[PDB]
Amino acid sequence: VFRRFVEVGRVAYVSFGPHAGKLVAIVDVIDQNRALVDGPCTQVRRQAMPFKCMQLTDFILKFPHSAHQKYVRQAWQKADINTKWAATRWAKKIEARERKAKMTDFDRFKVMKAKKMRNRIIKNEVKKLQKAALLK
Amino acid sequence: EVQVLVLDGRGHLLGRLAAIVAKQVLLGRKVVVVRCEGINISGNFYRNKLKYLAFLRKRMNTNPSRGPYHFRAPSRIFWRTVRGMLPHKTKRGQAALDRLKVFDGIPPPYDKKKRMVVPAALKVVRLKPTRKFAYLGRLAHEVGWKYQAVTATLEEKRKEKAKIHYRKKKQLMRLRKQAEKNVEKKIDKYTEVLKTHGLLV
Amino acid sequence: MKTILSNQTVDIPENVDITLKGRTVIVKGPRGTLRRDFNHINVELSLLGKKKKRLRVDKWWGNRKELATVRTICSHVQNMIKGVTLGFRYKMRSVYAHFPINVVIQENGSLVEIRNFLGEKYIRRVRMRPGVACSVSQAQKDELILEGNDIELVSNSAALIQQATTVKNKDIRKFLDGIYVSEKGTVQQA
Amino acid sequence: MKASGTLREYKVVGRCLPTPKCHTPPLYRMRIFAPNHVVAKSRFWYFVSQLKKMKKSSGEIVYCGQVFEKSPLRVKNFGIWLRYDSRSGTHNMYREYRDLTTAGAVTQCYRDMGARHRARAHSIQIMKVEEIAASKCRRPAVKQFHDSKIKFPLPHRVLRRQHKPRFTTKRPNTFF
RNA sequence: ACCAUCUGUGGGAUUAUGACUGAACGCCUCUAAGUCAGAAUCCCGCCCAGGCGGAACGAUACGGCAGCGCCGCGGAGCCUCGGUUGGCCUCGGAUAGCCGGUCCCCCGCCGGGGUCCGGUGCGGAGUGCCCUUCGUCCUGGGAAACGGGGCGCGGCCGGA
RNA sequence: ACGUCGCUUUUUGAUCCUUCGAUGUCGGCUCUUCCUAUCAUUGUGAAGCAGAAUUCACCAAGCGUUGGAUUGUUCACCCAC
RNA sequence: GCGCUGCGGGAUGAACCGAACGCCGGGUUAAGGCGCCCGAUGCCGACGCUCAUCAGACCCCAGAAAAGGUGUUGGUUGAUAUAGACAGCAGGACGGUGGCCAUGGAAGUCGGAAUCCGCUAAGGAGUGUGUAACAACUCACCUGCCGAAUCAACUAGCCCU
RNA sequence: GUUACAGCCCCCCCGGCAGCAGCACUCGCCGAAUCCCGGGGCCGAGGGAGCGAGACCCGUCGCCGCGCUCUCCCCCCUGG
C-alpha cells in the first residue's frame, strides 16, 4: 500500500525547522529517527535531519550511499530536480499560499471584485444548466 | 471561529475533549457536543467498565438519594467529565457549565450543520494503533443506559437523509465544474486575477 | 528494538482467487468463498505475480508483539485457502462406559441433539455455527462428521459439542464419557 | 555530573605539581565527555584521583580543550564500554550506537542508560569509546542499518500540529 | 394472626474456569492479535418513588358594553435587562489508507458493483468557501435579458 | 522442622497526644449497616477424588448463620434442630 | 527551626523546600510548576521504557517484604553451528559387566564409595519411568531428512503475582 | 569479488584556490578583541543651581562633550 520509501536518493521536502521549505536528498540512514541529508543545489549542507520534519516526494536520485556531495550534485542536476519540482502541483500549491499571504490591501480589493463577478457568471450558467436538465 | 461551536464526539477521547471544551466555555464560546455515544476512552473496555462500576459503588450510606448521581447516558457522562474540569461551585463555573450542551446522536437543529473535530483529542492522533480503547456508547449501555438501540435506529435514519443531501451536493458540484468550462472565455480574465494572487491553482 | 522489515509470503493455487479490499481478504475457490477482516493488525498486504499469484504480508517497525502477527495472518490465509479447496472435516467420537450417547441431527446438520449422556433425561441441543454441517458417520458407529470451510467455525462447533457432554461432580479421570474430536482433516484429499 | 544538553568531548591533560622529589611529574591525558569545560575538569580530577593518588590540591590542569569530530558528515558505529552502579551492585556493559559524532553517541548512551536502567549520570563511568567496523557490530538494533540498499516507508504519520488549527472540519490523514 | 388466606418474575456483558483458531519459538501453546461457552456476583428489566425535567390534549372569565385572544412587523412615547459588531444549509467515515469522475452488469430513471481515468502533504483544500456597505447623478462598454424585487397573494411538497 | 519475610488491629501490652468548669463503663436486649481471612448456598479448578462422603484452592459477602440448661457474664460447655 | 512568623510552593498541615514582612508601581526570580480546575508548553520538544480484569504518577509524606514470571527491554558469562547447529519428523543407544562392597531382594537405576576399557556414528559403570529381582520403555551420546543462526545460566529496568 | 558501466576509506604532495566558527541556519567561547538603529511597558521624585554685578522684563545656570566668529581664500545649491 506504501508508495514513498525512505531510501538513498529519495528527495524530501523539509516541512519545519531551520531549512523549512527546501528540498534535500537522503544520502544515508543513521538510525530509525535520523537520516543524513544533503541538498547541494538547494543550499542545505550535509547534516543529520529527523524524519519528523521530512515529507517524502516522488523523486529518487541514483547515487551510492554516503557518496560525496559532488556526486549528489551531479545526479541532482542530471535529473534536474529543481524544474521538475516546480512543475508539480505540490510546489504550485506552495507558491499559491505564498502569493495569498503576500496580498496587499489593494490586491485583496482587486481579488474580491473579480470574485463578485466570476462567481456570478458561474452562478447564471449553473442556473441555466439547472433549467436545461429539468426540461430534459 | 463561530458563535456556537458544534463538535462531533465520534472518534474523540473523553478526557482530552473535555479539557478543550472546558476551557472554551470558560472563555464564553457556547459549545455543543453531539454523538457523545461515539466518544472513545483509552484502555480496554473491561478496565473502563470496572472504573464506572466502581463509580456506582460510591453512594451516601445513610441516604443514597442525596449521594452521587450516576448518569448512564453517554451525553451525561461526558457532561460530568466537563463539570469535573470546571469550578462548578462558583457562579463563573456554573455560567460556564450552562454554555455547554451535550447530546447523544445528532438531534435537530445540529444535524444540518457542519460539525467540527478537535485533532488534539482524536483517538487516531492521540493513541497508538495497538492500544485498546472503549466506546462510551457500549460502556453506557452496560451500566444502565436504555436508549442505545433507539439512538442507533435514529442515527441510521439521519445518515440516510445526509447521503441524499450529499448526492445532491455532488450533483451540484459536478454542474459547477461543468459551468466553469462553458464560460471559461467569459471569466478567463477574472481567473487570472485569482491565479496571480494564489486564490486558484 | 524495532525491526525495519519482516515479511512472510504465501503461495496461491491456480484454482484459487484472492482479492484484497484493504486488509480484508476474500478467498474464492471450488468449495465457496471465505472473507476475513484483518483491520485489527497494522500490516501491509500485497499481491505479487500474474501467471502464478502470491500474497505477501509486510510489517515495518514492529516490536516483538507486533512481529508475531505476521505468521498469524499467513496461517489464517493458508487455512482459508485450505477451506475453499479441500474444506475441513472434524471427526468426533462418542466415548461411553455404560449409557450409549444418542446423537440425532436436525435442520440439515444445523442442530445436534445429544441424549442419554450419563443417563440424564436432559437432551443437549447444540447449534452448529453457520456454514458448518454435522452428520453421523455411516462407515463407523459413534462418530460424527463436522464439515465446513472455516476452520474456526468448524472447530468451534466441535468445541461446543465437546463441552456440552461434560461430567460434573464426578472423578473425570474415570467417567471418561463424552464426544471428543478424534481426527482433523479435509473433505477432499489432495 | 548532569548530562545536560548534548555532551562535548574534552581532552584534559594534567599532572602533579613539581616537588623536590619529582621535578618533572608525568603528564596524564584523559577523554572527558561533559556539558562544559568546568565539569570536564571536575570529572578529570575525579578519575585521576581513583587511578592515581593525584588530587586537585597537589595537581595541575595543564590543558583542557574540546575535541572536535574528525568526520561529522560520516555515519559511524560507536562501541562504548562503561560501568555503572545499579540499585544492587556494579555492572560493566558494552553498548553500540550509530551517530555522526563520537560525543553524540556518548550522549545517546547517557539517555539510553537513563531509559532502560534508570541510571543517573553520576553513577555512570565511561571507560572506552571507539568507532567499530560494521562487520564487528554485535547489537542487532545497529546491525540492521548495514544495508547498501536500505528501504522503508514512514507509516502512520501522526499529526503533530494538533493545535493549529485547534478546531477543524477535517479529520487528519495519517497515510502520506 | 403462618393463628386463616393469596402472590413473589425476565434479559445482558462477563468472573473463576474450561476451550477454538493461532503466532511468539518451522514444534507446541486458551493469548500475544482474533474467537467461544460461562455463574447465588455485577448492570438492567419487573417492582416502589417521580427533577428548580419534559410531552400531548381540554376549557379558558358578558349584559358588563366588561375581561381576554389573535392579526394588522398599526401609530407612537414610557419604564427595565443587556449581550453582540457578516454567513457557511449537514456524506459516511478511513487512517498499513483516502477522495473525485466515467463505460458496462443488476436493484425499478434512481442506487450498488467491476473495470478505467484523475487528485492525495488533502486545492471538489475550514491553512477553506460564500457574501460585502459610501450613496447618487451624467454616460460607454461588458455580463444578463432562462433577469431582479415585493409576511404581495394563493396553492402544493418535504421535515417529528 | 531448622530458618526466614510479611499482613491485621478482631487480644494484651508499650506510650500519654486529645478529653478531669465530666465524651455516662460491663453484659444482654433491640436495630441497621459494613468487612472477608467463605461455615452454608451459586459457578468452578485439584486429591492419596470408583460411588457416597471428605479435604485443598479460585471467582464470590447476593443470601442465610437458629431454639435452649448453667453463668451478670464477653468467653466457655452441653442438649437439639 | 517552630514557639514569637506572616509570605510563595508541598491540595490540606507549627516544624518541610524557597524566602523572612513599612505603604505602592514596574521589572526579575527562588522553591515549585505550565492537559482542565488553575497563572504558565496551544513547543509540529529529544531519546527510550511501560499495558496493569488492585497500572503509574515528585523531599518530609502519609502504604509494603521475602520470594517468583517462557511479559518485555537491555546487559554479563559460557556453549553449538554451512565439516550442517537449534526445532521438528525417524533409527541406533552396544561387550566386558549382573564393575566393587553391601543387601533377602539390588542385574545402570534402595545405599556408600570407585565413574575403566577393544568396538564404531555413538552408547554411560546411566537422566528418568519400571520390576521382588528381571525384563521392558526411555534419556544423554550419535546418525538420516532439513538449511541459518541457536542453546544454557545469571543479572536489573518497567510491569505482573 | 576489489573499479569495471558506481562509489567509500586511508597515506604522499606548500597538495592548490576561494571561504572561514559562512551569507549553505553542521559543531563554540568571546568583546578595551563592539558599535549603530528601532519597538513595547512603567515612571517624572525635586524646585531661589546668579561670584555676575550693585544681579532690576528675566538665574537657558554648574560639570561634561561639541560648533561658529573675532584669519583669509576656494567650491556647490537656492542675501540664505
Ligand SMILES: COc1ccc(C[C@H]2NC[C@H](O)[C@H]2OC(C)=O)cc1
Ligand atoms: C473506666 O471507665 C471510664 C472512665 C472514665 C469515664 C468518663 C471519661 N471518659 C472520657 C471523658 O474524659 C470522661 O467522660 C466524662 C463525661 O466524664 C468513663 C468510663
Ligand SMILES: [K+]
Ligand atoms: K476527664
Ligand SMILES: [Mg+2]
Ligand atoms: Mg442501582
Ligand SMILES: [Mg+2]
Ligand atoms: Mg434504576
Ligand SMILES: [Mg+2]
Ligand atoms: Mg464424589
Ligand SMILES: [Mg+2]
Ligand atoms: Mg466429556
Ligand SMILES: [Mg+2]
Ligand atoms: Mg545498545
Ligand SMILES: [Mg+2]
Ligand atoms: Mg482554532
Ligand SMILES: [Mg+2]
Ligand atoms: Mg400469615
Ligand SMILES: [Mg+2]
Ligand atoms: Mg450470558
Ligand SMILES: [Mg+2]
Ligand atoms: Mg492450539
Ligand SMILES: [Mg+2]
Ligand atoms: Mg480466558
Ligand SMILES: [Mg+2]
Ligand atoms: Mg460469550
Ligand SMILES: [Mg+2]
Ligand atoms: Mg451597540
Ligand SMILES: [Mg+2]
Ligand atoms: Mg516455622
Ligand SMILES: [Mg+2]
Ligand atoms: Mg490517655
